[PDB]
Design an enzyme around this catalytic site. Structure first.
Site, short mmCIF file in Angstrom:
data_model
loop_
_atom_site.label_atom_id
_atom_site.label_comp_id
_atom_site.label_asym_id
_atom_site.label_seq_id
_atom_site.Cartn_x
_atom_site.Cartn_y
_atom_site.Cartn_z
N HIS A 41 0.92 -1.17 -0.08
CA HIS A 41 0.01 0.05 -0.07
C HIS A 41 0.89 1.21 0.16
O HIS A 41 0.22 2.31 0.02
CB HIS A 41 -0.96 -0.18 1.14
N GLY A 143 2.83 6.02 10.11
CA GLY A 143 4.17 5.83 9.80
C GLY A 143 5.19 4.86 10.28
O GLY A 143 6.20 4.59 9.84
N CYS A 145 4.14 1.62 9.40
CA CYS A 145 3.70 0.47 8.58
C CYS A 145 5.15 0.17 8.07
O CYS A 145 5.96 0.83 7.69
CB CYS A 145 3.03 0.99 7.28
C1 LIG Z 1 -8.87 -1.02 8.32
C2 LIG Z 1 -9.59 0.24 8.34
C3 LIG Z 1 -11.16 0.10 8.60
C4 LIG Z 1 -11.96 1.07 8.20
C5 LIG Z 1 -11.43 2.35 8.34
C6 LIG Z 1 -10.00 2.42 8.03
C7 LIG Z 1 -9.19 1.40 8.03
C8 LIG Z 1 -7.75 1.56 7.88
O1 LIG Z 1 -7.59 1.28 6.39
C9 LIG Z 1 -5.91 1.28 6.07
C10 LIG Z 1 -5.75 0.27 5.03
C11 LIG Z 1 -4.40 0.57 4.37
CL1 LIG Z 1 -4.21 -0.47 3.24
C12 LIG Z 1 -3.49 1.26 5.18
C13 LIG Z 1 -3.93 1.81 6.35
C14 LIG Z 1 -2.63 2.56 7.20
C15 LIG Z 1 -2.04 3.53 6.40
C16 LIG Z 1 -1.16 4.31 7.30
C17 LIG Z 1 0.16 5.45 6.31
C18 LIG Z 1 -0.53 6.12 5.27
N1 LIG Z 1 0.29 6.86 4.55
C19 LIG Z 1 1.76 7.19 5.05
O2 LIG Z 1 2.82 7.89 4.19
N2 LIG Z 1 2.24 6.16 6.09
C20 LIG Z 1 1.51 5.31 6.69
O3 LIG Z 1 2.20 4.70 7.89
C21 LIG Z 1 -0.78 4.31 8.49
N3 LIG Z 1 -1.46 3.38 9.22
C22 LIG Z 1 -1.51 2.93 10.64
C23 LIG Z 1 -1.93 4.13 11.38
C24 LIG Z 1 -1.67 3.80 12.85
C25 LIG Z 1 -1.21 2.65 13.39
N4 LIG Z 1 -0.91 1.47 12.55
C26 LIG Z 1 -1.03 1.90 11.20
C27 LIG Z 1 -2.67 2.65 8.60
O4 LIG Z 1 -3.44 1.62 9.32
C28 LIG Z 1 -5.17 2.03 6.71
#
Ligand SMILES: Cc1ccccc1COc1cc(Cl)cc(-c2cc(-c3c[nH]c(=O)[nH]c3=O)cn(-c3cccnc3)c2=O)c1
Ligand SMILES: Cc1ccccc1COc1cc(Cl)cc(-c2cc(-c3c[nH]c(=O)[nH]c3=O)cn(-c3cccnc3)c2=O)c1
Lengths: 303, 301
Positions: A41, A143, A145
């Site tokens: 992603h 950030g 991921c």
């Molecule tokens: C699953 C679900 C259900 C309903 C509504 C929303 C959701 C969430 O849906 C997604 C799908 C995908 Cl494919 C990625 C992410 C995501 C991206 C990023 C991110 C983006 N852009 C950057 O530049 N850097 C990055 O890290 C970071 N986090 C993240 C945030 C905090 C803790 N852990 C992780 C993501 O969860 C989220």
């Protein structure tokens, strides 16, 4: 003496963390030999996220759409491909700090260490379990991921987890390093829920042995039980079933201790049915299920 | 989201760990530049523990009585001195993996990561706090002496603890990296009771703020308290006194959440009174006191 939630030493993994940017999306990559692994992603814009076509998104990108930074230096991307939900970026220089490693997929109830990273830079390490519902209860911010989870065996790093997303409930979902998801999740911003979680019974038993090893034994009793009888109680309290394999796994702990596994099941049965309330175990008022039998052996033996 | 007992990445410290042997006694040392730091009780035998005279034991040793092993390599000791309760062994090769570092002596309530080691090799890493009674509640076996505790704010390692001994209660005592013990303890096998182990109140407050930041408010109430009245109540649960320094230190978390420090003190007073009543906070059924205000801001945002 003492018992703490202990992570593996993270040095061998810290040397592999890099930053990967595609457009305005930035996250972490894992650099081993001349390949950097990261969540696919990364190639999504905010709007791609809602319903991405990763085949088409990647067909539109070339090597120069990816900036890879190992701290100060830029790694020139000379190739790219997807393996399941993980992007593989071939780079022009091999990581001189690549450790002995292998990619391994773990089962629910197994524990591992997470090296939480931001902008390619390690920021903290903590110990996690793969929940029975295939989520992990991590600590991650935007950030994070591409942060990875791992175990160490002797001198070999076994990478088992790459961080992809946070679910609306605040728990976390990711893949093995071949890009296969743990659990029934998809890397898309769309409503999705983990199944109801359960408690990892074999790990609770392991931790009760750790308690005995540490002199905490008020919960032992004169009774024993059967696998079949115990599992009736377990199912009723949302505990995972205990299998003969689990009994065997706990063998060396019963030896090291002098308490038979079905004897300890009798204590756990009573703890479930009556609580502890007054008392604590190993400084906890909850029944801890994120130590495996091997975790207990390694911590209490000094491995 | 989420909240874990998070340690610093240990790589910078792993590259400094060596094994030190003197006679039959073996423990870990910390190799920085051309000096190996280790507990001076490496020069003791089993028969010296009750009343060691370290100056007398040390004068009988030469450089080649100390065997230092870095991985597979034997480091040559070319000199030695004693500084308080730490021995400094000069070796003929500086550690190429030496990180940017400093020594700092910490106060009760401060947290740090521990790299538990045996025979110069790491076993694992975990997070600790300096208890109010100057012990730490570590996880340590025989051979762990010389393991160190540290923080790595930015890219500089601050060494704050070296492990020396386990008290009969099962808690742990050690020194700063200048060899001065935390607390009244001595590197001698004599009776030495640790003070009452009180709860680090300011840390518990930081952690309640962490819970609010992460989206949980069930434990708040409509009351406030004076600082004096809070301390009168909290000390009846063996909580450390909360000072105006602690109140100032909590300012930033107070601002991010909109909860005045003394209003969170009121909530804590009620939690002590009521317990959890079957609930948890950040996944714990006990009030957690090994996260500092600084830790919370580091992990939460
Ligand atoms: C699953 C679900 C259900 C309903 C509504 C929303 C959701 C969430 O849906 C997604 C799908 C995908 Cl494919 C990625 C992410 C995501 C991206 C990023 C991110 C983006 N852009 C950057 O530049 N850097 C990055 O890290 C970071 N986090 C993240 C945030 C905090 C803790 N852990 C992780 C993501 O969860 C989220
Ligand atoms: C303080 C006190 C009060 C009353 C009764 C007993 C006591 C304890 O009295 C001392 C004093 C000193 Cl100065 C050292 C120790 C001690 C040595 C060793 C040790 C020896 N021999 C090796 O070859 N290697 C080694 O590590 C290891 N541990 C140890 C053990 C487990 C966890 N953490 C640490 C020590 O506590 C103990």
């Amino acid at each position: 003496s003492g018992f703490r939630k202990m992570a593996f030493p993270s040095g061998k993994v810290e040397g592999c963390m890099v930053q990967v940017t595609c457009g305005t999306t930035t996250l972490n990559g894992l650099w081993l030999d001349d390949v950097v692994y990261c969540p696919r992603h990364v190639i999504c814009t905010s709007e791609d996220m809602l319903n991405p076509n990763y085949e088409d998104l990647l067909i539109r990108k070339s090597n120069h759409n990816f900036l890879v930074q190992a701290g100060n230096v830029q790694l020139r991307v000379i190739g790219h491909s997807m393996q399941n939900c993980v992007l593989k970026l071939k780079v022009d220089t091999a990581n001189p700090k690549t450790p002995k490693y292998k990619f391994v997929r773990i089962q629910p109830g197994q524990t591992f260490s997470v090296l939480a990273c931001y902008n390619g830079s390690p920021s903290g390490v903590y110990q996690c379990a793969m929940r029975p519902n295939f989520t992990i209860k991590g600590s991650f911010l935007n950030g994070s991921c591409g942060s990875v989870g791992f175990n160490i065996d002797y001198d070999c790093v076994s990478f088992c987890y790459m961080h992809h997303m946070e679910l609306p409930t605040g728990v976390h979902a990711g893949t093995d390093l071949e890009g296969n998801f743990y659990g029934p999740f998809v890397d898309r911003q769309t409503a999705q829920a983990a199944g109801t979680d359960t408690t990892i019974t074999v790990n609770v038993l392991a931790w009760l042995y750790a308690a005995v090893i540490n002199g905490d034994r008020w919960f032992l009793n004169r009774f024993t039980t059967t696998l079949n009888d115990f599992n009736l109680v377990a199912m009723k309290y949302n505990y995972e079933p205990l299998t003969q394999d689990h009994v065997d796994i706990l063998g060396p702990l019963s030896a090291q201790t002098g308490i038979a596994v079905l004897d300890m099941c009798a204590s756990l049965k009573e703890l479930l049915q009556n609580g502890m309330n007054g008392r604590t175990i190993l400084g906890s008022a909850l029944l801890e299920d994120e130590f495996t039998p091997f975790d207990v052996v390694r911590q209490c033996s000094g491995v």
